């Protein structure tokens, strides 16, 4: 069954104020892109999500430095424009794959591709919304004590737990990891 | 009698989470100085307070580019260490009056010859709740889309505007000013 | 009537080859900003002031550390230019109240859409007039041993003292601040 | 016989308020070394001037840049204290010679070696006095719109021109110059 | 001739960075609906501009409450789209002729008969150019200090003064007063 | 127990870089006599203070008029020179007791009694570290808003509340006194 320290751990300081299902990554986490890319834990953990349970995925700047704050940026900004669906994979793709994602420019060609204006990118990119959502995000990273570049957190008390999962069969980590989702959701 | 657009204006935007009374300031800010050593604003508008109503200062970045960020992350310190009153001022005059605050290192010195441990000074510094609470302030300051270096915000909803007061006399600006955030404090 | 200690104090070491009316101010200073804006101090004591006897103004260092350095050299550029009343309200509103100018550059936009060229003030900021003015500027501060941002001293003799005046009523304070000077210019 | 453009040149703005004989140096320069060490210059001068005619020393910034302020200072405090034939060699060796003057503390040691109590040499370089006698160099060197690093001028009016003088001769360039100060002192 | 007081007032804290031909409005300002409709100010003044002087026309709020809000939003979009011309008359009848508009859906059909795409339009009114548009309609009106609904200032510094001109004959007042724009405007 | 209002008040704006105990006195006070000669209360809180916790006092002005201006110098002096130990209680009884100490001359008697040479007395009393001594008691004085002739302050946070003690027995007094210090002194 659902054990604590099985496919899950329990936070010694639960973070009051946290978003539902919390998850952190970066355009440079190699195994994050195998999550969106391949896996698809995102869809799968959504599907499963009872009605009124929100998704919430944050970006991290520990990883990429400057690019990596950027990214951030970029992140928040997609957010702001609501854009998420159409620019997450060719920022993984841009990043990782095709290595065409080399500076803020690069990023800001992502986002002209996918439709946004360049004119109105500028604007998000410079608004006070993106600046607060950034240090949204920096803040969310550090109430958590976040150590690593990726991580799913439930109701700011529980963590999930990959590495506590069949990783043998990956229909089977993909079904199970979304259960602990929704398990933890209450 | 107290009037939106008189000695006080309302946000369009009413930050929810926001400190009851939120004050933002840099110790670059010199009338700041003038506020703190001369005018001692704060104290006098703490008097005036209602019981339970309390006072937050939040610093800017926006002036000293890098020391105006380290000088941030020290104001996190002081606050996680609870020694804002011993910091305050040395920080303002070694900025300012002294001229003596050129580096990060000089601000630890401040706080050291407050009586802060070095060792212990360092070890805030760099803890995860001072990186939290440094994302904090400059959220807030985004949510409130600041626009300048210093003001004052009460419930989220209103913001002080000292430009609709009775300057000519100085004892009754303060009070004036202590009264109108009591009064737009409920 | 009019006593020493009441609303003036003499000095104990009388300067030489003071001006006849002297004032030190900043663009950063509170009591100032009344005084010129509100109260107009300035033009009510030149008003009574009696034919010859000059109002000397000075700008001071203590506060705003670098930019207190910076608006004093843009005073001394000013007093160069003979533009004083042009600048001097921009500058305080700049400073104080739309608190805009944050950096030399902030200074120097002020000097620009008051009329002045850009070239022009460049020039005069660089000069060997403006090199000296500041000087002078530093000095006198030194020579009337100026503790505080704002005072106002008589033939060297006199510091005048508002803490010694009928406060209650703005009209009636300013007059009696005017006639206290018109009075010790003799 | 004496000629404008032969041994001194004269000023096409005359400085209102100079010294009778202005000399400008620096512990950093050379030339100044040389002068006071081995042509004895300034005894020379000061041996043929009329009674009553006072030989003024100014110490300038532009050289050393930081230590070059540091110097000016303590020229300052050395005036202040009277002690100028005391220091005026050991800071000349200490920079030049031996190369023991590194920083402000190397300063304050010779002053100390000197028979000046620490204590007071301390007090004397924050009194109001030296702050004064700062700026009061600070202002000579931009009035007579200074370009090198030494130089001397007569009544504000003339500038001596050792280049345009005899020297062939040590002894006789320094009765030369010492003459041309005496001739132009009147 | 064109006197101060006459034609055009000044600013006794003339605007910098405020564009050189800047008018304010209402859609439910009668003396705007005037203005555009029959004595066609906007079309005069343009026609006798210099080369380079643009027109800018901004609207405002006081007056229209919610409705008020929604216009000066659908301003922006009208500016964002470079659309003014196609809907300024439809706006102005709409509201005030016909009276046909009295929600943010009919300003909405406006655009669309206009000629813009219902998905545009609202594309263009989610905008951020739009959203900062909207900040700088709203701070230009509070920059100059606006207190009526229409208004039109010239260089920041002059504000037109048509209570002075001859109202007698409307085709010597329209004259009469694009005649002051073009003479203020030097 | 010890209790604010009881053997201690406190201040409403504690004073910053002050020295640890803190006493303000006057040559022309009288308990402050009882206090030294007879109480010994600065041997006794001196003797109970931890490793490291200095005693400081200063002079007032307010007593004596000139002769209390003077006896504020000399005081300076006695500290420039260390000799506090020497001279005061014959100052105290001179002023006092015998009543010889009626002028300058008279203080500066007693400083040759006790070993200082007269040529020594006059060169500190003239020296910058007496002139900067003496702006030192002035400014302590005031900047704890001093109000009596006498007062102890610890950590420029506690004001030692004499009235407030068990003064039937002055061996009680005494202990209670030290003992309130030593206790504030943390």
């Not at 659902?2 to 952190?24: C, H, I, M, R, S």
């Not at 953990?45 to 990596?68: I, S």
């Not at 799913?152 to 506590?164: D, E, S």
Request: aromatic fraction near 12%.
């Amino acid at each position: 069954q659902y054990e604590d320290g099985k496919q899950y751990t329990t936070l010694e300081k639960p973070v009051a104020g946290a978003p539902q299902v919390l998850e952190f990554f970066s355009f440079f986490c190699p195994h994050c892109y195998q999550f969106e890319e391949v896996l698809h834990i995102s869809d799968n953990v959504k599907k499963k999500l009872p009605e009124g349970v929100k998704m919430t995925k944050y970006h991290v700047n520990f990883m990429g430095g400057d690019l990596g704050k950027d990214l951030t940026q970029a992140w928040a900004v997609a957010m702001a424009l609501g854009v998420e669906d159409k620019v997450t994979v060719p920022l993984f793709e841009g990043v990782q794959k095709t290595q065409t994602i080399r500076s803020a420019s690069d990023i800001r060609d992502v986002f002209i591709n996918a439709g946004i204006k360049g004119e109105e990118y500028d604007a998000a990119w410079n608004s006070f919304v993106v600046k607060s959502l950034v240090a949204q995000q920096e803040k969310a990273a550090a109430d958590v004590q976040l150590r690593g570049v990726a991580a799913m957190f439930v109701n700011g008390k529980y963590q999930l737990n990959p590495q506590g999962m069949d990783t043998s069969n990956m229909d089977v980590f993909v079904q199970q990891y979304a259960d602990t989702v929704k398990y933890l959701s209450e």
